[PDB]
Amino acid sequence: LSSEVITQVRSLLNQGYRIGTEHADKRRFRTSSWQPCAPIQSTNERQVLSELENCLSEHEGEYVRLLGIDTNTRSRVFEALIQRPD
């Protein structure tokens, strides 16, 4: 994980937002096609970071996008493209 991503996920978790991740190959990524990833059910920074790194490793050479979710509202509050195939 990059520092800038680390500092983003810290900021997201500080506010109480939940973390989710979505993955897609280069052709689906072209067409704004994303798929659900393994749910990160953990509020601790360390465990979140670890599960994100594991999910990145899961889907090597595919687009990965990180997002901020407010459970109460159930609405998205941040969009961020974290990883690219190259």
Binding site: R27, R28, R30, T31
Partner: protein, 101 residues
């Protein structure tokens, strides 16, 4: 007489090897083949008659060739064409001739 066809028509009639190459390329770009035909060839007549299935669970070109052989064994006097569809871009991406009477 001079009748031509849409793609690759000005090349020499594709050899089985060349057809395989083209199918191969289709596979690696994930566009499963569709085989279709008609006893005539009209540019206005957009559609053609599909060869009883599109081969989505395609792993090798040699299956698509073998399909083509069955079609000419039954319709050897009929033009035959193979198509590739990009379900993600929602576009037909291949269309060329493999047989003529």
């Amino acid at each position: 007489k001079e009748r031509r066809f849409e793609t690759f028509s000005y090349l020499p009639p594709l050899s089985d090897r060349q057809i395989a190459a083209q199918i191969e390329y289709m596979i690696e770009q994930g566009f499963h083949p569709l085989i279709e035909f008609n006893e005539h060839s009209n540019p206005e007549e957009f559609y053609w008659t599909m060869w009883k299935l599109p081969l989505f669970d395609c792993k090798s070109p040699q299956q698509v060739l073998d399909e083509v052989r069955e079609c000419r064994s039954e319709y050897g006097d009929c033009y035959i064409r193979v198509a590739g569809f990009d379900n993600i871009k929602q576009c037909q991406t291949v269309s060329f001739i493999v047989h003529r009477p």
